[PDB]
Curated annotation (Swiss-Prot):
Cadherins are calcium-dependent cell adhesion proteins. They preferentially interact with themselves in a homophilic manner in connecting cells. CDH23 is required for establishing and/or maintaining the proper organization of the stereocilia bundle of hair cells in the cochlea and the vestibule during late embryonic/early postnatal development. It is part of the functional network formed by USH1C, USH1G, CDH23 and MYO7A that mediates mechanotransduction in cochlear hair cells. Required for normal hearing. Three calcium ions are usually bound at the interface of each cadherin domain and rigidify the connections, imparting a strong curvature to the full-length ectodomain. Cadherin repeats 1 and 2 mediate calcium-dependent heterophilic interaction with PCDH15. Glycans are attached at residues 5, 157, 218. This is Cadherin-23. Interacts with USH1C and USH1G. antiparallel heterodimer with PCDH15. Isoform C1: Interacts with CAMSAP3; leading to inhibit CAMSAP3 ability to induce microtubule bundle formation. Residues 4-102, 104-211, 213-300 form the Cadherin domain. It is linked to Defects in Cdh23 are the cause of waltzer (v) phenotype. Waltzer mice are characterized by deafness and vestibular dysfunction due to degeneration of the neuroepithelium within the inner ear. In adult animals relatively high levels of expression are found in testis, skeletal muscle, heart, eye and thymus, and lower expression in kidney, lung and brain. Found in the sensory hair cells of the inner ear. It is found in: Cell membrane. It comes from the Eukaryota. It comes from Mus musculus (Mouse).
Amino acid sequence: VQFSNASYEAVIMENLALGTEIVRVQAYSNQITYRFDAYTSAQAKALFKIDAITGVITVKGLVDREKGDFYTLTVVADDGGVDSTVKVYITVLDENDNSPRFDFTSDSAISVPEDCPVGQRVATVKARDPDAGSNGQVVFSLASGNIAGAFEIITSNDSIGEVFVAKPLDREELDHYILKVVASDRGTPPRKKDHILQVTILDVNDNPPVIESPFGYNVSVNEGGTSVVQVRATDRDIGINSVLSYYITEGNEDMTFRMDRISGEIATRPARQNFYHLVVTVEDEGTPTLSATTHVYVTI
Ligand SMILES: [Ca+2]
Ligand SMILES: [Ca+2]
Ligand SMILES: [Ca+2]
Ligand SMILES: [Ca+2]
Ligand SMILES: [Ca+2]
Ligand SMILES: [Ca+2]
C-alpha cells in the first residue's frame, strides 16, 4: 500500500536498446503485482513495460525523442485486496540521429546577369533538422564549384541560406557555376546534406567591336562596283551584343564608295579624287551601343 518513493524519475537517451532497465517500483504491505494503470497513454505502453513481480520498467519499443521527450507512467501496486498508484516520470534526451533536409522551396537553377552587383542576393535555400539544440541548428556553406569565390552563402535563423554575389562576375571568363550547397547541423560531430544550385551567367553588352587591323587600311584601286577593301572586327559578347554594323561616317561626300552594313566590304559605286580618307564606324547591336573607329586610306 506504500511505495519506496513518492514518485520515480528516469533520464534516458533516445534509441536506447530494448530490454534496458530504467527504474524499479517497489511497494510493501500478501503478494504485490505491478501494472500500468488504464489511463497511461497507448504511446507510453508501446514504449515501456513493467514486470508484474519485480516492478522493473524496461524499454519495450523504439524511444524516439523527435516523437516525444517526456512520459508519465502511472503504476498500480495490486495486493489482491482501490490500489495504491505512483507516478513515473521519463525524460528522453536527444541523439544527433537526423541530418538536415533541404525544403523544396530551395532554389536549384538561377540566371544571373554578369553585371549583378557584389552584395546582391541571387538565391535562397532552406533546410531543417528536427534534432534538439546544436544537433538541430543548420549552417550553410558552398563546398565546391564556387570558382574564384564568385558567391557567398549567409545563414539566418539556423534555417535559411541567402546566396550573394561575392566577387564581380564576367560571362566572357565563366558563363556557369555548379554550386554544391552543404547544410551542416552543429552536432559534434556534425551531420551534412548537399544540394546542387546551377547558376547560368547572362550576357551584358560590355565588349566593344575590335578592328582586326590595328592601324586601319591603306589600299590602291584602279577600277563600276569594284571591291576596294573589307573592314573586319570581332566582339567578345554573344547573340545581338556581338552582331556588328559597318558604316563609312566621313570622307565619302562625293559618293565614290559604298559599304555593306553586314559584311564591311567597301566597293566603288556603279557611277574623281586621287586620294580618299574614309572614317569607318563599327557598332554592335546591344545596349548600350558600343563602337570602334578605323581609317581607310584609298589611292586611285
Ligand atoms: Ca530520433
Ligand atoms: Ca541533426
Ligand atoms: Ca534526435
Ligand atoms: Ca564581361
Ligand atoms: Ca558580355
Ligand atoms: Ca559587344
